[PDB]
Structures are given as structure tokens and as C-alpha cells.
Design a protein around this ligand. Structure first.
Ligand SMILES: *[C@@H]1O[C@H](CO)[C@@H](O[C@@H]2O[C@H](CO)[C@@H](O)[C@H](O)[C@H]2NC(C)=O)[C@H](O)[C@H]1NC(C)=O
Ligand SMILES: CC(C)CCC[C@@H](C)[C@H]1CC[C@H]2[C@@H]3CC=C4C[C@@H](O)CC[C@]4(C)[C@H]3CC[C@]12C
Lengths: 40, 390, 33, 517, 388
């Protein structure tokens, strides 16, 4: 970064990978729910 | 009539002997290694590069040899006279490297009118073109004081546009659509590859012969080496790109692979960096392949200017690119000397080439030199005893 | 360290070529059907 | 193109199957001087808004996002959109509503003591989620309910905004350097003049008038009967570059008088290196980012998604009308996904999200438009123009010596030319002109010969009321509700208008293909 | 896709330009460099032109592969020398770049006629890395004396090509091919490359030698080794054929084995008689290999060698390595004998492993390999004229 920044447990690649994984899980859950609906 | 060719040749040779007796009197063993390579370039690479025609190998290589042999005697005379200002001068190694550079210019011009001219026309064209080239290069080197050590402007562009002007004056309406003898053969293309490879390998000595010993000569060698290396890759890529079904074309491989060496001539000794030399070579190869694919049909069918070897796409357009690269390198602080003199050298080279080619073609167009008919173009049998078997 | 740099350069070139070929193959399989 | 397949990501692949087969044509069609003239036009037409909006954004956000960030984001998104989008004629860049949202979000973060750039990162993170779901469920099938009514209203409003801002910049130039009997000859020039200067505003007006006049003159010369046809059309395609060159040389030959020039960043660096870097941590830079704001960013993400979606989709509708001879196809689902995803990615890098601006895209399409012997003949549909524009915008920083000698007044005349040439494809503008014409001079078009004159005038007057309301909305602090007010015309067309207009009148006046019902 | 080759060539050229920008900075050895350059681009280029319908591809792919190879080898060898730092470009860098190109061309000789230009670009890129790492290992870790590069160039390229051809084995081409046949003028053209290699090989073996005694010894040993190798190759070519006929393959290739086998012992004081003995053994081994071992490899071991580059580079390279071991044992050199043995073994093993990996990469059906019917044909990748 720039100047002095607070140190976090997760680095920027780690936190963005975690956020992308959570987003992918939410998208997959929504898609599976939509797949279940309109069939039964 | 029947004796015009030997009579003109003997008169020219006696004139050369008299001029050598009048004006010519006798580091060397250092630049001799590089002279040998330029001589091998002049007499083998150009000689066999133009042997791609299936029925014109004999005339190609033999007239190349004759033209270059007379050129090394006439260019020595004219360049020594111009440098010495009419006084007697002594001949050293640099004197015979410049005479092979004049021969190179004349051979580049020969590449444009190949297959459509008589040997007598080639004698006349050599005699006139050496005078025009020597005067233009004296202007560029001494009046303009431009840096053109590899001679992208004084040699390549000059010869290419000189040959274009001569071919324009010597235009044949019957050959605009094409000719049956204007096509390559397998082994003729192999000989053309012999010439191409020799030119490609020995081009660094061609660019670095007159360069100042030390850092500048090494820079010229390295820049030419890597520019040619990049040019081969880009020429192959764009030859596969522009042709039908991605098939490689042998004309592109035989000619456009030398465009990187042609274009890096002006920037040879400058500190343009090897990456800059490779960029110049890549751009020159792309430009040469695109020219061969598109502009040569436009020059032939529309502008009534037929280029047999496509010496425009190899020497003129890469030569103009080299002049522009020299201007940019002067701009970017890569060398001394002004931008204005580089631009003036490029403009004067192109203009003098065009004007001298117009005058030379007008002299050549006279029905006196036994030029072939439209039927007999690109045929060895007009002047040579061709064997029955191939 | 020079071996690491050379392997990195090879990895970059291989990744570029593989990504371009993957994009081309995906476009081809989407387009032909 | 707007039908619902019913398959997950069905509209995405359908747009992929439509334009990508023509990929080889998208490269070969650009080997013409008209494409080069279009590149030269759109380079300025996209760089000058980028510079102005970057300056305003840096002023209003303390340079957390500035000119360099906007230029880099524009270059990256334009390259990716030209190399992947199904409507390459669209121009991607920053816009006014995005600037208003940036101002509002900066004010909200400052009031609540939140980190503005980290909030932007989280909003861009929420943007990727929204557009994946919308494309998966084919949410771009709702665009089919936007008829010529809403399209023409939005286009006319955006053109009016563009022309009004172009004139307001000239008004600002006049106010900064008013015409005075006496002036102070000792005024500091760095970074900007600190007082009124002689001959500044008048010379700017001269340059703007000359630029607009020469652009219009060369556009007319394109359709005139002078010179050989090939040279005439070459000059007409290069009318804008020739006018720009003439006026730039005119300003260059005047040395004593000061004129405001384009200003670019010194190098590829962030506008504020003391605040943030190229990569912003989503967990916070100075302080720990609150957990609640990670979830609370969904509503601003929804607002930004609505803005970008409506802007880009209506722009795509306008630039790809059947009457504009776009015979290669456009992708509604793919381009929206690419735009919102690139915006979300650029948010992670501290760069603004971008959307397809109407004025620049319509100018770009009209620049490649070929007129027959009048009648639109064909459009040079190719990808090289947008890619070259993006590359030149990215390289604008490195070419400071060239951009520093170009006055803004020439760009103002160029903007005026773009605004007056953006109204061509609007039947609302044509009907507005009919309000000042005798009925016998009205053209032989289906919406005039089949509908009574006063009925058509009432139909035009209703639209002007909507235009005036949208103009009121823009000039109010609640300018972020503008897309909703524009949406409200869709109920007006499909519910309220049939009560006072017959079906034949509605079919003639609002026709997707300009047909006689 | 027909656009794979131009796309890959452009990407590789751009990568080379970027690397030369990042890592590269700025005369009595120049004639030797020119001799090596002529060898690399003419001798190898025309030596493989013996095929009647593959001359265009042989010479053109030779030029293209070597042109890419000089740049990529310059970068890789400079990086290995400078430990990842910038380096100056002298004449020695150009000589070593041409040596790397030579190794890649030796490998290319094995799979000639059965590969695409794209496969050749990929093989060049990978083989340069493997060869340069092996050469750095031998030169600086083991510190063996291989001034002529019998083990690091010739054996490495030969066994690299053997492994690549073994992975790229075609079942349809094991019993021969109708296009795998020489012609009269094609052999005449191949003699050009043979003669140029023979004439300029002493500069190949003495380019980077220490100035003084070692360089002169390398020149003289290479010259006399070739002089003996020519006579023995002619004799054994007459011996192994019916009615004492001379086979053009033997005269084209086996006459150059003396330069390969004398490479390790070039700068050593092995005397002209020792160099002549080495060259004679090299010529005999090369002719015997061409006569008997090449069909054995093709039919039984399923390794097809188009130009028979094994009999020219591998077996003479191993002979040269063993000769170096013996010469160190006889006191002709002050290097370690175990280091020479380690250099030979490591060169062979690294060549085999790199060839296996590169051949596995090249077997992917993405690079436009010719069909079994269209092997050894120029018309697959070139515009071939109607007449000969
Ligand atoms: C770059 O950012 C820093 C901090 O984000 C700015 O410094 C602030 O300036 C404002 C204006 O006076 C005041 O709040 C304080 O002086 C500073 N606050 C802090 C927390 O440092 C700086 O002005 C910015 N630079 C530019 C050119 O806008
Ligand atoms: C819509 C997109 C942005 C994803 C949805 C965001 C929500 C559901 C997820 C994504 C990433 C998550 C965070 C990832 C990591 C941490 C650090 C941990 O010590 C506390 C929880 C916390 C802070 C999580 C809270 C919930 C969170 C913000």
C-alpha cells in the first residue's frame, strides 16, 4: 500500500479470494434453488 | 546490332583502365575480414537471390556478376574523384568497401527490372546509376553530414526507387497481367534461399564496415544481428497470416527476412539498444510482408510499375522506415547530429533516386540495346545457351 | 535464482499461450453449436 | 435478441453466438481511412470528458480518485470491451450520474467517518454478484419493454445535457475572464490564472466558433457535389481532424494571449500517494472497516447497477436500431455483464466504474456510418476503433507535449458538433421541428399522413413535458432518481397513452422500425 | 486453427523484445563468429535438404528456428551467467547463442518432416532452457573441458531429438514413407551444407577457446580429425554397400563426425596423430551407425531419426566424451576424469529427460501436425511451385 496501513490477519489476495469464494457459494446456492423451483 | 554488347564493354573497360592510370595510385588487414563478407554478399547473395525465376537463373547470376564487377571499378573511380576533388588518390581497404556498396545499390536497382532488360542496358544503367548514387551519397555524408553508416537512405531506398523509376519508364503493357515465365521453381527457390541466407548472415559486416572502430562498430554488429533475428520471426508470422490457408510463401522468406537488416542501417551505430533494434526489425519485417502481399500488385496493375523481385518491399519501404527510425533516434537523444539533416538526407536520397532513374530509363528506352520482346521476358535463351536438360 | 527467473518466464509464456488457446477453443465450441 | 430463452445464461451464450462468428470481419473491415478518422475523433471525444471528470472527481474526493486513475480505468475497460464485447461500437467511460454517485458516497462516508475507497471496493464487490444473477436469469429481457418513446426521450435529454454543459463551459470561461476596460498585467499563471486576463474569453469564443463552423462546413462538403468523389469523401470523413488541426494551428500562432489547454498527469501514478495505493485492502487501509457497511453497501450497489444497466442498455438500443443499418448483431446480455464486471474489478483497484455513454457511442457509430447516394447505406462495424481509442486514452499521459498545445475551445466546438449531430436519429426532434411548420410542408412519413395534426402535436407536447420534468430532476439534489423517472414513462406509454390515443396512432408515432402500422 | 503459428511467433517475438529490454545492455573473435554463423545457417540448413519434397520446410524452418534460438539462448545463457542480473552483449554471447541454435537444429534434424513450425517453436523454446542449464552445470559446476562441445551440444541435441521422436512415434511411418526419399539435385544441394560444415568446423571448435596455445591446438586437431574422417567415411561407405557403391547419406553426414568426436579433446595436447585416430574412429562409427543402427532404432526401438542425426551427433558425441575421459587419464589435460564422465552422463540424462518432457508437450493435437500421408511434404505448410 502507501504510507502506514493497519495490519490485518488476511492479506489482500487472501481476503479477495475469500470474498470471491463466498460470492460463488451464494451464486451457486441461488442457482440450485432456482433449479429446484419450477420442477416440482 | 550484334556486337553492341562486347563493343560497349570493351570501351568501358578501356575507359576504366585509363581513368585508373590517371587518378588511382596504391587498418587494411583489419577491415579485410569484413570486406570479404561484403564481397560474398554482393557477388553471391544478390546473385542467387534473383535466381528464383524458373527460366532466368543464368542471366540473373551472370548479369549480377558482370554488373558488380564493372561497378567496383566505376564506383572506385567516381567516389575517389568526389572525395579527392579531382586530384590523384590512394586506394586502401575503405576505398574497395564503398565500391562494393555502389555495386550493391546497382544490384538493388537491377532487381526491379530483372528479366526485362538486356546486358547492354545493365551496363548503361550501372554507369549512370553509380554517378547518381555517388553524388547523392557525397551530398548526404559531407554536405548534410547525416549519420547513415548502414545506408538505409543512400543505398537501399536510393536503389529501390531508382529501379522503380527505370521500370516505370521501361513499362511493358503486355506484362501487366502477368507472364508465363515469371514464376519460380523448386530448385530455383533453393538457390534463392542460398542467396538469402548469405545476405542474412553477412549483413552485420555490411552495416559495420565503415563504422568507427571500438564501441560504434560493436553496436552496429549487435544491432544488425538482433534486428535480423526479430525480422525473421515477424516475416514468417505475417507470411503465414496474409497468404491463403496459412501456407508460407517462398518470396516472403527469401526477401522480407532481410528487411530488418535494411531498416536498422541508419540506426546501426547509434545507442538505440538491442530492444530498439529488435523493434525496428519486427516492424520492418511486417511492413515488407504486407508490401509483398498488397502493394506490389497495386504497383504493377494500377501504377504501371512492375517490380520483378519486389525490391520496393525489401529496400525502399524498409529503407524509408530506416530513415524515419534514424530521425526518431536523433529525436530521442540516441545520437548526435540534427533531425533536419536526417530528414534532408532521406528526401534528397528519394528525390535524386527518382530523377536519376527517370533519366536512366529514358536513355535505356532507346531501341538500340537489344532489349527482349514481351514474349521472351524472363527467358535465359535470349542471351545464353541454355542446356536442353534441367 | 536465475533458474527461478527462467522458470517464471516460461510460466508466463505458457500461461499466455494456454489462456489464448483456451479462449479460442471455448469461443469455437460455443459458436459451432 | 431480447427474447427470454428460459435457460440459465441463455441470453449470454446467444449474444456470444451472434457476434463472435464475425470476428475476422471485425478486424478486416477497419482497413479504411474512415475508421482512422473515427479513431481520431473519438480519441478527443473520450479523452476530454475523461480529463474533466477526473479533475472534478479529484477535487470532490480529495484526489482519492483522479485523472490518472480514470484514464487507466478507461484504457483497461475499453481494451477489454473492444476485444470481447458484442457491440464494439459502444464507448465505455465515466459519466455524470457516476460522478454524482461518487460525490454522494464521499459525503456519506465523510459524515459517518467511513473510508470512501474501501466502501467503493465493497460496492464493486457487490456489483459482481448482482450482474451474474441478472445475466443468469436473463434479466436483460426486460429491455424489450423500452420502446422508441423512452429511447428517444433519453437520447434527446442526454444530447440537451451535453450541449448545455458545452455552452456552460464557455459561460464559465467568460465569467472567469470578463471583458474589462483595464487589467492587471502582473497575474500569477501557475497553476491557473489568479485574475482576469485580456483577450482570453474572446479568443476562446473565436476558437470555438471556428471549430464548430469548420466541422459543419466539412460535414456539408461531404454531402456536396465538389471535387472527385473519393477525395471528397476522404476529406468529409476527416472533417473533424482537419478542423481541429486548423484551429489548433490558429491558436498556436497566437502566442501572447493565454488560452486554457488540456492538462494530463505527470506520470502513471495515483493522484494522492499519501492516502491510498494501487491496491486497496477491502478490510480497511487506515482503520478497520465496519462489518455492517459490508452488507449495507448492497443498496448503493443496487442504485449503481440500475444506473449502469439502464444507461448501457438504452445506449445499445439507440446505436443498434434497425434503421441504422447495423447488420452484424448486438449483445445485450454479454456487454452488460462485461461492463458491470469490469466496473467491479476497477473498484478493487481504486478506479471508477464505467458505463456506455450515449453521446460518445452515438458519435462513434455516426463516424463509421456510410451514407448512400440522404439514406444510410452501411456501418463499418469493426473492433479496431474502440481498441485504438482505449489505447490512445491510456497513452495520453505519455504524450503530454502534444496535448498541452490543444485549447479547450476547439474541444468545445467539437462537443457542439457532436451534440448537433447526435439529434439526427430522433423522431422526437423531427416532430419538435414540425411544431413550427405549416402542415402542408410536413414530410411524407407514416406518423404524419395517418394521424391528425393536433393529435401528433399533443403527442409531442406530452413528451416535452416528460423532458421538462427530467430537466427539473437533473437540476435538483435528488438527481440519482433520474433513471426511475425515465422508467416511469414506460407505464405512461403502455397504460395512460392508450386512454387518449388510438392504437393506430400509437403504432405510427412509436414504431420500432418506422413502419406504417 | 490456422492462426496458431503467426500468433505464437508474434507472442514469442514480443516476449524476446521485452526480455532484451529488461536484461540486456551493450572484435578479434568476429571472423570466428561469422564462420560459426555460416555453419549454423547454411550447413545445417542445407544438410537436411536431401528430401525431394521437403527442401523448403527444411531450410526455412532451419532459419526460423535458429533466428528465434539465438535471441532466446542469449537471454537464457546471460541470465544463467549473471545470476538473474543484467549483462553486456559481446561477441562471445553471439557465439554461444549460435551454439544454442546449433543444438536446437541438431534436435530438429531428428523429427524433420513429421512436425509443424509451431511444434518447432515450442521445441526450440524448451530445448534452449534445458540445454543452457545443462551447459551451465557442465561448465561451472563440474568445470569440465568441452571446448568443442561434443557432449553439451551434439550428444545433447541428438538424444533430445531421439526422445522427442520416440514420444512422437507414428505407427504408419514405421515401415517407410513414399515422400521419405532423396533426389539427385536435392543431394547436390545437401553437399553444399556438408562442405560448408566441413570447411568451417575448426572455427566451431575453436571460437571460445582460450587465446594462445589452446586455440591453435583446437584448430589443428579439428582440421586433421576431419581430414582423417573423410577418408575413413568414404572407405566404410564403400565397404557397407553392395558392390562398393557410395551412399550419398554417408558422404553427406559421416564425413563430419571427426569434428564432433574431436570437440572435447580439441584444446588438449592430443597431437595431430591422436586427432586423426579420433576422426577415423568417428567416421567408422558414423558409417556403421547409418548402415545398421538406424534401421534397428526405427523398426525395433520405434525411434525414427529422419536425418540420422544419432549417427552424426550422438554416437560421435559419446565417442568424443569417452576420448576426453581417456585423454584426461593419459595426462593430456589437467581437468578431473570423473568430472568428464559426470559431464557426459549428465548431458545424456538431461537430454533424455528434456526430450521426453518436450515431446509430451508437443504430442498435444493443437500445433497442426501433418497426417501420416502428408509427412515429408512441403505442400502442408508452403506454397509449392508447379514445376521442379
Ligand atoms: C491527500 O489525502 C490527504 C489525506 O487523505 C489530504 O490531507 C488532508 O487535507 C485536508 C485538506 O486540508 C485536511 O483534512 C487535512 O489537512 C488532511 N487530513 C488528513 C487526515 O491527512 C491531502 O490534502 C490530499 N492531497 C490532495 C492533493 O488532495
Ligand atoms: C456480496 C459479496 C460481497 C459477498 C457477501 C459478503 C458477506 C456475506 C461475507 C463475504 C466476506 C465475509 C468476511 C470475510 C472475512 C471475515 C473476517 C473474520 O474475522 C470476521 C468475518 C469477516 C469480516 C467476513 C464477514 C462476512 C463477509 C463480509
Amino acid at each position: 500500500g502507501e504510507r502506514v496501513q493497519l495490519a490485518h490477519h488476511f492479506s489482500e489476495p487472501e481476503i479477495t479470494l475469500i470474498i470471491f469464494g463466498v460470492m460463488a457459494g451464494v451464486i451457486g446456492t441461488i442457482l440450485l434453488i432456482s433449479y429446484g423451483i419450477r420442477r416440482l | 546490332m550484334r556486337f553492341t554488347f562486347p563493343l560497349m564493354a570493351i570501351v568501358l573497360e578501356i575507359a576504366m583502365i585509363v581513368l585508373f592510370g590517371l587518378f588511382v595510385e596504391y587498418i587494411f588487414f583489419e577491415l579485410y575480414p569484413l570486406f570479404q563478407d561484403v564481397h560474398v554478399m554482393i557477388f553471391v547473395g544478390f546473385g542467387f537471390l534473383m535466381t528464383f525465376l524458373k527460366k532466368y537463373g543464368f542471366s540473373s547470376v551472370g548479369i549480377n556478376l558482370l554488373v558488380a564487377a564493372l561497378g567496383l571499378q566505376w564506383g572506385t573511380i567516381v567516389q575517389g574523384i568526389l572525395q579527392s576533388q579531382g586530384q590523384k588518390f590512394n586506394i586502401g581497404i575503405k576505398n574497395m568497401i564503398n565500391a562494393d556498396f555502389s555495386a550493391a545499390t546497382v544490384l538493388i536497382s537491377f532487381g526491379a527490372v530483372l528479366g526485362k532488360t538486356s546486358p547492354t542496358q545493365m551496363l548503361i544503367m550501372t554507369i549512370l546509376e553509380i554517378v547518381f548514387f555517388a553524388h547523392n551519397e557525397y551530398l548526404v555524408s559531407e554536405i548534410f553530414k547525416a549519420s547513415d553508416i548502414g545506408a538505409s537512405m543512400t543505398i537501399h531506398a536510393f536503389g529501390a526507387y531508382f529501379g522503380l523509376a527505370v521500370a516505370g519508364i521501361l513499362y511493358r503493357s503486355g506484362l501487366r497481367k502477368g507472364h508465363e515465365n515469371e514464376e519460380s521453381a523448386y530448385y530455383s527457390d533453393l538457390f534463392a534461399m542460398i542467396g538469402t541466407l548469405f545476405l542474412w548472415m553477412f549483413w552485420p559486416s555490411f552495416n559495420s564496415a565503415i563504422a568507427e572502430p571500438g564501441d560504434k562498430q560493436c553496436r552496429a554488429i549487435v544491432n544488425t544481428y538482433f534486428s535480423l533475428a526479430a525480422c525473421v520471426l515477424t516475416a514468417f508470422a505475417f507470411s503465414s497470416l496474409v497468404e491463403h490457408r496459412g501456407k508460407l510463401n517462398m518470396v516472403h522468406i527469401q526477401n522480407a527476412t532481410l528487411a530488418g537488416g535494411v531498416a536498422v542501417g541508419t540506426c546501426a551505430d547509434m545507442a538505440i539498444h538491442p530492444f530498439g533494434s529488435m523493434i525496428i526489425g519486427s516492424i520492418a519485417g511486417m511492413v515488407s510482408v504486407l508490401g509483398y502481399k498488397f502493394l506490389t500488385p497495386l504497383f504493377t496493375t494500377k501504377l504501371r510499375i512492375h517490380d520483378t523481385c519486389g525490391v520496393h518491399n525489401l529496400h525502399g519501404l524498409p529503407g524509408v522506415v530506416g530513415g524515419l527510425a534514424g530521425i526518431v533516434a536523433v529525436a530521442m537523444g540516441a545520437s548526435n547530429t540534427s533531425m533536419a539533416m536526417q530528414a534532408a538526407a532521406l528526401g534528397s536520397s528519394i528525390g535524386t533516386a527518382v530523377v536519376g532513374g527517370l533519366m536512366t530509363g529514358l536513355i535505356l528506352k532507346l531501341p538500340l540495346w537489344g532489349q527482349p520482346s514481351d514474349q521472351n521476358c524472363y527467358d535465359d535463351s535470349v542471351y545464353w545457351k541454355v542446356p536442353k536438360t534441367r | 535464482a536465475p533458474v527461478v527467473i527462467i522458470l517464471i518466464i516460461l510460466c508466463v509464456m505458457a500461461g499466455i499461450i494456454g489462456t489464448i488457446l483456451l479462449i479460442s477453443y471455448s469461443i469455437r465450441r460455443l459458436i459451432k453449436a | 435478441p431480447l427474447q427470454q430463452t428460459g435457460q440459465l445464461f441463455g441470453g449470454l451464450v446467444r449474444d456470444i453466438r451472434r457476434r463472435y462468428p464475425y470476428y475476422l470481419s471485425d478486424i478486416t473491415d477497419a482497413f479504411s481511412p474512415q475508421v482512422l478518422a473515427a479513431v481520431i475523433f473519438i480519441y478527443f471525444a473520450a479523452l476530454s470528458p475523461a480529463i474533466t471528470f477526473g479533475g472534478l472527481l479529484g477535487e470532490k474526493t480529495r484526489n482519492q480518485m483522479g485523472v490518472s486513475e480514470l484514464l487507466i480505468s478507461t484504457a483497461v475497460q475499453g481494451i477489454l470491451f473492444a476485444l470481447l464485447g458484442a457491440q464494439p461500437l459502444l464507448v465505455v467511460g465515466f459519466s455524470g450520474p457516476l460522478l454524482v454517485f461518487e460525490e454522494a458516497f464521499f459525503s456519506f462516508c465523510e459524515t459517518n467517518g467511513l473510508e470512501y475507497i474501501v466502501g467503493r471496493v465493497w460496492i464493486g464487490f457487490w456489483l459482481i454478484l448482482l450482474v451474474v444473477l441478472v445475466v443468469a436469469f436473463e434479466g436483460s429481457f426486460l429491455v424489450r419493454f423500452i420502446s422508441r418513446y423512452t429511447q428517444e426521450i433519453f437520447s434527446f435529454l442526454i444530447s440537451l445535457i451535453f450541449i448545455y454543459e458545452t455552452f456552460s463551459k464557455l459561460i464559465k470561461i467568460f465569467q472567469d475572464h470578463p471583458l474589462q476596460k483595464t487589467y492587471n498585467y502582473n497575474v500569477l499563471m501557475v497553476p491557473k490564472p489568479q485574475g482576469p486576463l485580456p483577450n482570453t474569453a474572446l479568443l476562446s469564443l473565436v476558437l470555438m466558433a471556428g471549430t464548430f463552423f469548420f466541422a459543419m462546413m466539412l460535414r456539408k462538403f461531404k454531402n456536396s457535389s465538389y471535387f472527385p468523389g473519393k477525395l471528397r469523401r476522404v476529406i468529409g470523413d476527416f472533417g473533424v481532424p482537419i478542423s481541429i488541426l486548423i484551429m489548433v494551428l490558429v491558436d498556436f500562432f497566437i502566442q501572447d494571449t493565454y488560452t486554457q489547454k488540456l492538462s494530463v498527469p505527470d506520470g502513471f501514478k495515483v493522484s494522492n500517494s499519501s492516502a491510498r495505493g494501487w491496491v486497496i485492502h477491502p478490510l480497511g487501509l487506515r482503520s478497520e472497516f465496519p462489518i455492517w457497511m459490508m452488507f449495507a453497501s448492497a443498496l448503493p450497489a443496487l442504485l449503481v447497477f440500475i444506473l449502469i444497466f439502464l444507461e448501457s442498455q438504452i445506449t445499445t438500443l439507440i446505436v443498434s436500431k434497425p434503421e441504422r443499418k447495423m447488420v452484424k448483431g448486438s449483445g445485450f446480455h454479454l456487454d452488460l455483464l462485461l461492463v458491470v464486471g469490469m466496473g467491479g474489478v476497477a473498484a478493487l483497484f481504486g478506479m471508477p466504474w464505467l458505463s456506455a455513454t450515449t453521446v460518445r457511442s452515438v458519435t462513434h457509430a455516426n463516424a463509421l456510418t456510410v451514407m448512400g447516394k440522404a439514406q444510410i447505406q452501411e456501418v463499418k462495424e469493426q473492433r479496431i476503433s474502440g481498441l485504438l481509442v482505449a489505447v490512445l486514452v491510456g497513452l495520453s499521459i505519455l504524450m503530454e507535449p502534444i496535448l498541452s498545445r490543444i485549447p479547450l475551445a476547439v474541444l468545445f466546438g467539437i462537443f457542439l458538433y457532436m451534440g448537433v449531430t447526435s439529434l439526427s436519429g430522433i423522431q422526437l426532434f423531427d416532430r419538435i421541428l414540425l411544431l413550427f411548420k405549416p402542415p402542408k410542408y410536413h414530410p411524407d412519413v407514416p406518423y404524419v399522413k395517418r394521424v391528425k395534426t393536433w393529435r401528433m402535436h399533443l403527442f409531442t407536447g406530452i413528451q416535452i413535458i416528460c423532458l421538462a420534468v427530467l430537466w427539473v430532476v437533473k437540476s435538483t439534489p435528488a438527481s440519482l432518481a433520474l433513471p426511475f423517472v425515465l422508467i416511469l414513462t414506460v407505464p405512461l406509454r403502455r397504460v395512460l397513452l392508450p386512454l387518449i390515443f388510438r392504437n393506430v396512432e400509437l403504432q405510427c408515432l412509436d414504431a420500432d422500425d418506422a413502419k406504417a402500422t
